[PDB]
């Protein structure tokens, strides 16, 4: 401590870390309480937090989600009534390029071996990265050739997932699959073989999923509009309405007290477009009380809707 | 008695008109034995009383059908005797006008009555009208019967229907009952204070009937309480009616509630209200109310949505 | 037809028939319409129906449920203004006795072979008669000896059923069983052998019935007092009460929304004497809505009671 | 400024009483530099304002605790200077009575107020009472404070509570505020038309409070609608309350219904009503009603039994 004014001991630098963040660093010395430590991106100040505290000895600032944005010129400016010292560190063309391709190695190294997983769309080829795409151009090889990209087989990425998909796989689609993660200078590969065993077993649950999923879409279904209990004064009239759906249009059927129920002039059921069932009583008498159910069903499934008309005599 | 000399007819078949215009066939028989038969005959065909000088036959609600020849025959093993009461043509034309005499000669004083439709004159015959001549005259003049002024007679009662009465319908109406060459009649003067009240009322019942027939009523379709589990959708409806067609509004807890996109109310062609919550939350539970009204009156239909959480 | 006055052609007599009724009869001749046919028991007139009709030729009157009551002196009296004829037929001591023992033969002849049937009380020995006991004294033989009557083995009759019962049968009770129907002069027998096969199989369903019937008596049981749905304004308090029973006293358990429910200060359950469960909410809040169940159970059985507190906010 | 001559105190620590009885510690400093420190001290211990000739320290809700010795020290590298404001013993006995002077000298005119419990006199001090001498005198006489006549002071407010007032409590009350050798007081005459209204009301609130506390209320236990299937048995209950204990009755559809053996009502110890249908038929469904009432008031609890057939 003098005075002559604070000063750096180590100048600005960068390293990569853990979840592939760029951490900047520098050591500083000769630091009064009342000293100022302030960072700047492109002369525009980074207004994170307090510039009225410090001790020793290292000074960091962490860049997150790092990418082309966090490029440009960074500087840490130490000051206080005694003096000022700048340490400037510059991240642009051919400085930055060195950095990007430097993150990716670390990204690329965290790339869980290629694994096989099927979905209702096809079979799918994914590897995990810890963690994340950027300027890490990406490529795939089926048996030593590029892959012609289509609507049946696509590539893509998702958060920390790198995937190849394969809608409507078939035997022609078995073979050797490889990943080319390209940082800028180097390349990196990871592989897997979609064949026999594994495959027969993926195309297995694939089929499963699709059949079940086609099914869980057009199964008949009561959408809503009945209550669970209605309670009505004897003699009054009653209108319930209930929307259904299915594809094919469904067959509705009514049930009072667990046996079938006939439409009729006094207890009239309608059905329409295969969209709307219409329960209706032109004067609820005690004998019209009990427990009703509506039951839609088509080829992919059934489903019922259960209500209770209880009645009181005024 | 004594064999022989067959049971005699001391007096032959004569009649009379007794009580509520019942005809009585009378006769006085003698020398009867408990082994004697008493049969009655209308136009050669057996009429049975109970089980066969006090023999009688009662004719109820006398008419043109009860006409024909009557005989009451008396016979056993000792002797047979016949009497006849012949009733066709002239001898019957005098029976009708005599059963009528008794009729006309007994009907309450004309009375006035207002109906929802008009003004009514009427008399009660403690008897029957079958083919009795009707005379309704207005001010000493035959009444022009139209689609406004009808006369008639319905079960025990005669009348004159004066639909939509003006004061022009005011005056001395007559009701002549005509039985042969005889005329017993009943008059009554529609004027002044009598009418002041009659017409007075008649209007009340009219205006009032107009209303109890167009005041917007709520027809039917709503429950009194629905219970639904949180999250499902509810679909009540309810037909209304009025003339002029009513205007509807709703309320959720005594406070007027307007339609949204979530709890939707509609109302089409003025005869149906659709109430439609769309994913009933607890918030949507409550005491709802549907009020229709028009110029003639109003009405509210209430229900309560309750909800449990599953 | 004269006249000299009606008269009998055959005098009063009796025969037995079908469902062992005594029918009386007689032929009559010379009958005007207006004639009188009237029957009398002990000079006291039988006032059945019309005495002002007749033709030819037979005249009957049927005694039903026949027994010691319908004894005494019967007479048919024809009259009308011409004359009178009586035919008298007398049914007392040694006339009647002849009749009683005469019905029974016909009763006894209709006696469906002895059959084996077990109940929850024991095994039971019954034969059917078409149809009915009276002065037909009845007796039983187990292996050629009278049967000592007790509280474990009783005799009896029921409408048209003649039975021997056998509470708590055991092997000592197998053997030859025979029926002695005794009219007055003769005797009649019908038999069956409670042994091996049949028996092992009766004592079978016997055991069944008793176990199941002991059970269907002390199984726990909700007797009543809950509704199926209650609907209450938010904030209000709620008292439900529900009586149960079992022997042994039962264990009650509550369930809200299909999992267990804890008594507590705000949702307090009691139970008492093993007779009365006590559901209670000191301010029903929406979160107290849902579907509850009460479930009593002891060693012989379970049983639940299901209700729903739905709530509306004023 | 200019090295050296350390930042000087032109005027030493003096005080004043400003605003809502806040005390101000004043001083006039000179020759300060932006590199100068300004620390405040109460009894040798650091008090921190914000972040260290206009220096000030605010004392909120002044009391006996804010007592002790004060110092405000000025120092940098050029020179250090101290001032002291000593506050213990006599010098502090004059601060209390001066903060009090400002207090007493500003309170609204006595006002009168009726509570459900009695009659209230009160004044609002736009300030604070900590240890301020209270003088309530009734007719120029010290008031005998008992279990009926309390004095006191609650947050910003002074008062005199006259429970169950008679006219004997009528007269010229005094409220002397005593700050040292000074006395500012407030009088007010409880008599005549002022009292006529005050007491007037006080009773209303009393009688009325008696009632809203014993009128038979229905406590809780009944549903608003029960639904049960035909034939099962129903067991509602409901605790009530009142003083004198209420009498209960029931109704089934606006018509008073009496207990039977089938649909049984009981009511024991006057705090619980048991309603108990025993095999609910359709006939037993309906709109039931439980009415309790006593001399102070009444209440009804409604519910509806509805039934379906299974």
Author numbering:
A (entry chain B), C (entry chain B): 1353 to 1666
B (entry chain A), D (entry chain A): 1352 to 1403, 1409 to 1666
Q: What do the study authors state?
A:
Members of the myomesin protein family function as molecular bridges that connect major filament systems in the central M-band of muscle sarcomeres, which is a central locus of passive stress sensing. To unravel the mechanism of molecular elasticity in such filament-connecting proteins, we have determined the overall architecture of the complete C-terminal immunoglobulin domain array of myomesin by X-ray crystallography, electron microscopy, solution X-ray scattering, and atomic force microscopy. Our data reveal a dimeric tail-to-tail filament structure of about 360 Å in length, which is folded into an irregular superhelical coil arrangement of almost identical α-helix/domain modules. The myomesin filament can be stretched to about 2.5-fold its original length by reversible unfolding of these linkers, a mechanism that to our knowledge has not been observed previously.
First, we determined the overall architecture of the complete myomesin domain array, including Ig domains My9–My10–My11–My12–My13, from crystal structures of a total of three filament fragments: the My9–My11 triplet, determined at 2.5 Å resolution; the My10–My11 doublet, at 1.9 Å resolution; and the homodimeric My11–My13 triplet at 3.5 Å resolution. As the available independent structures of helix-connected Ig domain doublets show only limited variation in terms of domain/domain arrangements, a reliable overall structural model of the complete C-terminal myomesin Ig domain array My9–My13 can be generated. This reveals a tail-to-tail filament structure with an overall length of 360 Å and a pronounced zigzag-type arrangement within the central, C-terminal myomesin dimerization module (My13), followed by a superhelical coil arrangement towards the two symmetrical distal ends. The right-handed superhelix is defined by almost constant twist angles of neighboring My domains of 26–27°, except the arrangement of My12–My13, which has an average twist angle of 68° and thus appears to be less regular than preceding parts My9–My10–My11–My12 of the filament. Whereas long six-turn helices are found in the My10–My11 and My12–My13 connecting segments, the corresponding helices in the other two connecting segments, My9–My10 and My11–My12, are slightly shorter, with about four turns each. Because of the smaller length of their linkers, My9–My10 and My11–My12 show limited direct interactions in their respective Ig doublets, whereas in the other two doublets, My10–My11 and My12–My13, the neighboring My domains are too far away from each other to form an interface. The complete filament structure of the My9–My13 dimer therefore is defined by an arrangement of nine rigid bodies, comprising eight Ig domains and the central My13 dimer. Although the precise orientation of different filament parts of myomesin in the sarcomere is unknown, available experimental data lead to a model in which the dimeric link via the C-terminal My13 domain in myomesin filaments is across the central M-line.
